[PDB]
Design a protein around this ligand. Structure first.
Ligand code: 8VT
Length: 138
């Protein structure tokens, strides 16, 4: 019921206590998913599950500043499975984004972009059927 890629506006940016919830299902034979928290053309937080990087499943996280990718943060805990429904929750905390998948903590990503109130869009893309994308204050 949502079209991918999907853009979710984050009015006034993000702030600590904001909880973003994404519900969807991974397609069969998926190759990738991506969440991109944007500050204009900059990517404050890219969260990128990769289903076949050299026959390994990995989650890659990074920031893009002035069109340049920085230092990648990689996690080999990989909770996604092709064909299966998922829930991604991203909780903004003071020093990091905190990510849980299917109610299990996955990773944290330290704020590199510091102007949280300018991170005003979330792009959701990749090999998913997207069911809902929303936010609340915790
Ligand atoms: C595929 O469709 C897309 C649509 C829209 C946007 C994007 C963006 O993809 C980009 C984004 O995910 C970025 C995050 O760091 O990594 C880019 O890929 C990176 C490799 O991950 C990055 N790969 C690795 O470092 C690597 C590979 C295997 C194991 C390992 O362990 C440390 C590391 C590669 N680095 C080098 C030196 O080639 O440089 C590429 C270009 O910057 C993606 O092209 C892709």
């Amino acid at each position: 019921p949502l079209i991918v890629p999907y853009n979710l506006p984050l009015p006034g940016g993000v702030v600590p206590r904001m909880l973003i919830t994404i519900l969807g299902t991974v397609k069969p034979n998926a190759n990738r998913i991506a969440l991109d928290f944007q500050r204009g053309n900059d990517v404050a937080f890219h969260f990128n599950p990769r289903f076949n990087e050299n026959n390994r499943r990995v989650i890659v996280c990074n920031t893009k500043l002035d069109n340049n990718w920085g230092r990648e943060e990689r996690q080999s805990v990989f909770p996604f499975e092709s064909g299966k429904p998922f829930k991604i929750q991203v909780l903004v905390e003071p020093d990091h984004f905190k990510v849980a998948v299917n109610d299990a903590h996955l990773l944290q990503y330290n704020h590199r972009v510091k102007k949280l109130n300018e991170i005003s869009k979330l792009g959701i893309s990749g090999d998913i059927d997207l069911t809902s994308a929303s936010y609340t204050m915790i």
